[PDB]
Amino acid sequence: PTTENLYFQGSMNIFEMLRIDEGLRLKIYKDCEGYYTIGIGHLLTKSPDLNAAKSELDKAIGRNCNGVITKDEAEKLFNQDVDAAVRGILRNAKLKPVYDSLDAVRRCAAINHVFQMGVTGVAGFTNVLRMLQQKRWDEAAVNLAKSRWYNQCPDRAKRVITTFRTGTWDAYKNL
Ligand SMILES: C#C[C@@H](O)c1ccccc1
């Protein structure tokens, strides 16, 4: 690894990670599951009604957006969504002990998974959680690859799974 490569881990964090997995869009769009989304993976609603999604957007941003936001607004909403995912893990009696047992990079993958799926969805992955606590990284990754989360939308989930296998940032290199 070159001096520069050893620097790459100092450049990666949860925000850079989810920015790569979710992308950055300033106008309402439908995600791989057809749900209305904006900014950096902010799901607006599961409703098929774009009017509901615009309604949620104006609530979330606090102004009349008509389906469009700024980069700074995207970043603020993203920061809030990351904070909610971390808070959701830390207050949960099932997820917290597993999170605490993980190294820093796998902790980012855990916050990413919760950002994407929500607390109850993730907390239902009983086998994977046990595998992760037991440092069975290959098995955890194979099991995550059986999930509907990954299989319905592999490009958004694949790097998180690789990160659970390896505990490094390699999946985020060389975009
Ligand atoms: C299952 C799983 C992992 O994404 C995870 C592990 C610990 C806390 C939250 C999520």
Please give the distance, rounded to the nearest whole angstrom, from the Cα atom of residue 31 to the centre of ligand 1: 22
Experimental resolution (Å) = 1.6
**Structure-token pair, residue 125:** 């992955």
Q: How many CB atoms lie within 10 A of CB 9?
A: 15
Please give the distance, rounded to the nearest whole angstrom, from the Cα atom of residue 125 to the centre of ligand 1: 8
Quote the CA–CA distance of 67 and 44 in Å, as a whole number: 11
Cβ neighbours for 139, distance < 8 A, ≥ 6 positions apart? 131
- Our CA angle for 50, 87, 96, nearest 5°, is 125
Tell me the three state secondary structure of residue 57.
helix
22 is known as an active-site residue: yes
E strand or H helix at 30, and its extent? strand 25-30
Task: For ligand 1, atom 4, name the residue with the nearest CA.
Answer: 110
Do the Cβ atoms of 43 and 56 come closer than 8 Å?
no
**Please, which residues bridge with residue 37 across strands?**
29, 43
Q: Among 4, 21, 22, 49, which one carries the catalytic annotation?
A: 22
CA 111 remoteness from chain centre: 6
Q: Which residues of 37-72 are buried (b: 16+ CB within 10 A; e: fewer)?
A: bbbbbbbbbeeeeeeebbebbeebbeeebebebeee
Cβ neighbours for 22, distance < 8 A, ≥ 6 positions apart? 40, 41, 156
Do the Cβ atoms of 107 and 99 come closer than 8 Å?
yes
Please give the distance, rounded to the nearest whole angstrom, from the Cα atom of residue 113 to the centre of ligand 1: 7
Q: Which atom of ligand 1 is nearest the CA belonging to 128?
A: 1
Quote the CA–CA distance of 172 and 5 in Å, as a whole number: 12
- Give me the amino acid identity at 21: D
Quote the CA–CA distance of 94 and 96 in Å, as a whole number: 6
CATH of the domain at 90: 1.10.530.40
Within a 13 Å sphere around the CA of 8, how many CA atoms are in the beta-carbon half?
A: 13
Give how many domains the chain has, as a whole number: 1
Domain span at 4? 1-175
31 is known as an active-site residue: yes
